[PDB]
Amino acid sequence: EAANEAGDSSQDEAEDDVKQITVRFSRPESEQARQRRVQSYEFLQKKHAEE
């Protein structure tokens, strides 16, 4: 679907979609939010996949 969206035109001009530096703040996470992230399913799945 992404390829079809890009293919709306036969010839696609070189997009000036340079990745602006969107480096986000490594915000100090609140202990409650950190516990929520640790207890999240994605974190457990990533920890399982680490092995």
Partner: protein
Amino acid sequence: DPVEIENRIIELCHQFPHGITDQVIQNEMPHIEAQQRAVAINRLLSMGQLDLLRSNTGLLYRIKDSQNAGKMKGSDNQEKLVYQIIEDAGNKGIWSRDIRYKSNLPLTEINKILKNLESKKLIKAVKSVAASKKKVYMLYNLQPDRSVTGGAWYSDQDFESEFVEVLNQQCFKFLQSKAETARESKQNPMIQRNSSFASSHEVWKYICELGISKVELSMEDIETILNTLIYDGKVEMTIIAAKEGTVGSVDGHMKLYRAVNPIIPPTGLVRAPCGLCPVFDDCHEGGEISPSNCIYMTEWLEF
């Protein structure tokens, strides 16, 4: 030894502050395979000493800004962890409240950080002219954006109504004189209309020759002034086709302005006190507000 690889990549990033591609690293160190270089880059990114850029030429790896220091008291970590979004905001600026909210730090710590950064000439605090609530912080090297601060009309966070009034009056006088000369020329109606027309560049140069104020007025400033005059119902603008000339502002299009008389004189409704009454809704035959004992019509008939 991957530590030597990381040190060499750090040295190469020091040699090129704008960032290095994978081709440069391969040319500097050809005896190391691509997988080891990729692992080294991944470790450098994990430990936070490198940043990735996606340019039209590919991937660039740049050393994180640590040498540029304004707040060394305490930890460089919080210094860069404030300067990061300071730079991300850049020209548009960012209020102290938003800096505190994005930094997730108390007000005292961020106040100390901002003061120490201002001490070593890294950030400048300018007053938001759009909403005079707090002072936004920008990079010292970056030029302040005209929308968030400054402007040819705003002077010290104060709108100059007298300045725009003088501009409007002078532009209207110039356009009226030009239209009068075009009418008195009476050479040909097309020639009269073309001579009554005044380009934005012409009136801008005329205003610059006048020199009412010290601030430099760009062409688009005079264009906005003439647009406000159009909104006043006193002048008319037409977009003609002209490829290139003394203006060269819009591609193939030129805006010509001319002073035009109003369509109709003031209507008959406004000549009666009832049409300009602010309490017209409360009008009634028998009551406190009656046409028989009206003060507006009394003063109008007495005058």
